[PDB]
Design a binder for this molecule. Structure first.
Ligand SMILES: Cc1ccncc1NC(=O)[C@H](c1cccc(Cl)c1)N(C)C
Ligand SMILES: Cc1ccncc1NC(=O)[C@H](c1cccc(Cl)c1)N(C)C
Lengths: 304, 304
């Protein structure tokens, strides 16, 4: 029993973190096999970030200009290329701590763990959701660029995020491991619109199922609703519209608790319209949306 | 910017987790040097747990009855002893992944990360506070016994908790790594009173300082208070009394923000008496108490 915002064990990722320095700038790199991945803005100075021409800035750089250090050992850079907003530094040594890995571009609403790093050293691990607006609400200071997000299936690490930028609103933006930004963001010091964000409805419902499994059942009621009726309430409260695909994904949780998905929707509708009346659910006084149905099943069954 | 409930990187602890089996029961062990540590209830069957005589149950056991497996390798047990509520299994091989470590008995109100494990394999990592009543609100299922709590200073892991029991109320109890339970708990299947819990006042204030540092300042007011006036409010709302030692510990945060500790106390007093009026602080609709002043400094400065 109990339900916590749990991150994956970070060990396999800690063994991949390196420090990358280019001129005056130092940030984090991810060392997988014989390639070190890092944000391309490592080649910029403060005068460049306003509107950098990354192609021209990278032309003034040679393999010997990129300093890569893994703990105390210096890696030898034998190749360098830019792929979208990431730099790929070929080194002469494969990382002996390279786990089984994949690069994946996650969907908005999905979750992942972040290993925050500074100077190539890990400081902490936390669980994040990729917001429907493609930002993440993380915890990152200057020096954290290059820190990554990931999921773990058995022994395989699926890297899904690389931290690049803090927006003027304090929210975070970054790329997949091919260097493609999530959302409309660009890697330059300009005011950037993070669109309207919505609450991940299927995740709130998954968390309500976690609450029932763990004993928090005060919010269950004698009501039901329909997808169209529920979605009229979701639009009013800026919640993502619920689809039959979402209902299908909540099937295991509906089977486990014996509570039909539309009956849980009616509980959510009443919570949206009336609030919590000063009560809490799983230690929270607000509707939590950063747990997927998969996360709830995983945490409630004990998958390692 | 941003503030998250962050756990320490779990890597150094993952390399210590083993599976311990005694007869029918399997739980987690912590392998440090040539000793494997685990809850002593591994020697019990379901008939024993109601009122076990651990001394007599351990007498029916030999070194060969304790099966220890680290990943796929079997460890050879050459000694066994009981220390309070923990068993210490001497093995013939020192763990080559043993980090620099210490055993510490943490104080109530202090925080630590938990690496939840099943069959010797890690499933997730989360940050916990030792409640003033010596329970922890974690996330543990059957099989998680032997999972540990820890803090990390530079390269040294300070192990502070070993999970033993879920109380009928769904909260968690365990021991330090010498086998002494935190609180009045005993390792037997009996109804056990977890005393009245209070909110960790110094931690709520630390979190209010984190909120100001990160831009959430709506709760700041034109008022002040005194330790005695504030403590009249803390007693009414079952908050731990604030002492000058707590004020001293909040000194770095007071120096950084320029907000005197008693002025922050007056904000807390008004939040306690009026609620949040439907607003949030650092993404929360309730006063968060599981961040110490140290955690706030660490997260806000970037300690790795
Ligand atoms: C300070 C900080 C805090 C938290 N997360 C990231 C940063 N860094 C940044 O946002 C900036 C930057 C500015 C503009 C565009 C981009 Cl891609 C990056 N770097 C270059 C220092
Ligand atoms: C099921 C479970 C879920 C979460 N955390 C722990 C447990 N296990 C327990 O609480 C029990 C037990 C019962 C009584 C006393 C003690 Cl010390 C232990 N074990 C033996 C299964």
């Amino acid at each position: 029993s109990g339900f916590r915002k749990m991150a994956f064990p970070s060990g396999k990722v800690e063994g991949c973190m390196v420090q990358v320095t280019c001129g005056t700038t130092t940030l984090n790199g991810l060392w997988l096999d014989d390639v070190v991945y890092c944000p391309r803005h490592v080649i910029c100075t403060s005068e460049d970030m306003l509107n950098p021409n990354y192609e021209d800035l990278l032309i003034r750089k040679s393999n010997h200009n990129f300093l890569v250090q893994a703990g105390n050992v210096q890696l030898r850079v034998i190749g360098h290329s830019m792929q979208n907003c990431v730099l790929k530094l070929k080194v002469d040594t494969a990382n002996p701590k390279t786990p089984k890995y994949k690069f994946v571009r996650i969907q908005p609403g999905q979750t992942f763990s972040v290993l925050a790093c500074y100077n190539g050293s890990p400081s902490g691990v936390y669980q994040c959701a990729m917001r429907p607006n493609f930002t993440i609400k993380g915890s990152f200071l200057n020096g954290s660029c290059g820190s990554v997000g990931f999921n773990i299936d058995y022994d395989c690490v699926s890297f899904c995020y690389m931290h690049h930028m803090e927006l003027p609103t304090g929210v975070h933006a970054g790329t997949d491991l091919e260097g493609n930004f999530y959302g409309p963001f660009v890697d330059r010091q300009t005011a950037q619109a993070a669109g309207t964000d919505t609450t991940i409805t299927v995740n709130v419902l998954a968390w309500l199922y976690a609450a029932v499994i763990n004993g928090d059942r005060w919010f269950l009621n004698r009501f039901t609703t329909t997808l169209n009726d529920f979605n009229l309430v979701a639009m009013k409260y800026n919640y993502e519209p619920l689809t039959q695909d979402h209902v299908d994904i909540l099937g295991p949780l509906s089977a486990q608790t014996g509570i039909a998905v539309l009956d849980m929707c009616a509980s959510l509708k009443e919570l949206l319209q009336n609030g919590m009346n000063g009560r809490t659910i799983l230690g929270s006084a607000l509707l939590e949306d950063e747990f997927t149905p998969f996360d709830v099943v995983r945490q409630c069954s004990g998958v390692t």
